[PDB]
Design a protein around this ligand. Sequence first.
Ligand code: UDP
Ligand code: UDP
Lengths: 272, 272
Amino acid sequence: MVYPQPKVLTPSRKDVLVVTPWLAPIVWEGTFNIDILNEQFRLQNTTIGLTVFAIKKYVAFLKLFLETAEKHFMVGHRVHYYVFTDQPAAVPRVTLGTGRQLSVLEVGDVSMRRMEMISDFSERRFLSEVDYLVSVDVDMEFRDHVGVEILTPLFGTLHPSFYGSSREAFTYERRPQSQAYIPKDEGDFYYMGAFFGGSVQEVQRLTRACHQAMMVDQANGIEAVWHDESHLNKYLLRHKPTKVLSPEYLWDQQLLGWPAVLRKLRFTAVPK
Amino acid sequence: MVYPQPKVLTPSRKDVLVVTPWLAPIVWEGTFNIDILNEQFRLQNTTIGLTVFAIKKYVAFLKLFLETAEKHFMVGHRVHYYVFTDQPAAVPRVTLGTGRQLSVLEVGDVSMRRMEMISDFSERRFLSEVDYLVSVDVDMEFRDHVGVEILTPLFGTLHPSFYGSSREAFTYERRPQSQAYIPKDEGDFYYMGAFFGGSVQEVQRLTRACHQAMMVDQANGIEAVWHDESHLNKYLLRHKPTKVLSPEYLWDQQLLGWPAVLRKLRFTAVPK
Ligand SMILES: O=c1ccn([C@@H]2O[C@H](COP(=O)(O)OP(=O)(O)O)[C@@H](O)[C@H]2O)c(=O)[nH]1
Ligand SMILES: O=c1ccn([C@@H]2O[C@H](COP(=O)(O)OP(=O)(O)O)[C@@H](O)[C@H]2O)c(=O)[nH]1
């Protein structure tokens, strides 16, 4: 299946880090050939589950989120959307391509809901067919390809406000009394809670660990500074991800524009 | 466990490709922090088996190969050397560091011996404790660190004579009648038969496939142009490796000097 030969003596990128110091790829445009990856993943009949929460007024974001996911997310691969909502009847009936299904799961501090709910759900036997789970915010739209290049045992996503920051500027939980605590001299990246995922087993492990950490902090009267993102960051510090997604995958154009290191804006915040 | 923070806006290398188009790291100096990797691998009590053939006059290369492996190969990790030889009594008694053991396996066209022998051996139950297998040439010496940065499910090594070559210059098997055949318009890299490895299961699969391909070619009266390296290259074309080692890991300084893209010469050919 012919494609350009890789060029050993030409860097993929001269302006960004494309592999972490523990040899996990950092996924930017120009670092992958999607035709090779699509083949690898279709040979395994890869099924991707996508979880999204749309609780209270956030059910209004589902229409664009699902319409644009159908244009850009994992097209050609098997996809199952799992929409967690307090308003199942408000979920828009969006037309889906072949091989793609959607289920609505009704949901009943609430800071723990996402990690609690994904943890319980990720352990269910009806996921036997799903290979990877991906968890994203709903108040977002896809604008360009998000595909199997992201898939791996465990991935997080560089927060778009902090990718250029030094670690002491990262808003990690800094109180030693919290289970999310990270010392000022530690930290590889600051990951955003709005896009993470991995194999079902790695997502079971991450969401369990985060939910259990959050319950310990609650018992102790402490709420981490950025809630489940704080616990995501302590988790991925100690269990390093096998791919890191660049901020192409989680961007806010109104806040941050279209800077030179972004060749594509793939999944972006919806305003107000 | 503190180490420098990764720099998102600084490339690891500006002179070489450090990730393949299917997102496998290509391992060069400055792309890994061995302290992070050593920790990950020691947490799993990683045991590395190293196979080497020393048949006929090549038993003379074992002394330096094992003395320098003790200085540079996987130091701190569990290592078991498996020396395949027709002269077990000629194997030098080299003093080994703690956690490192050596076994001698006596061996009885012969072009098939390496893939046949590693295939049979890799399936034995006494490997239950070994996590990865690495297969190298004996007429070589280690000069610098070769460590757990190479470990992964499946890896090959860029041939030091061809890393700068275009694919039509690669000495793949080009006859359609051989099981090793690769079309002129296909090929990612040219891997050398002198350093490859992976998990035990991936090495079982690669050496079986290569041995079975070689037996088909023998039945058909054809010998691939570069023998088991030709079949290694067809295998890794179709089953792409999860890391690629740069030519730091397989070099010939007498032939090729110390060019600018090599920051370290880690495992090099012994002359004449
Ligand atoms: O270091 C690189 C360079 C390119 N590519 C990808 O391989 C394909 C072809 O790359 P090329 O630069 O040759 O693009 P072309 O000029 O043929 O359009 C595209 O999907 C690139 O993003 C890659 O994965 N790593
Ligand atoms: O893109 C990079 C840059 C550095 N490192 C490694 O991380 C460690 C520290 O890197 P640094 O450049 O900060 O070296 P220092 O100047 O502190 O000696 C060394 O093992 C480097 O090879 C890496 O894995 N990827």
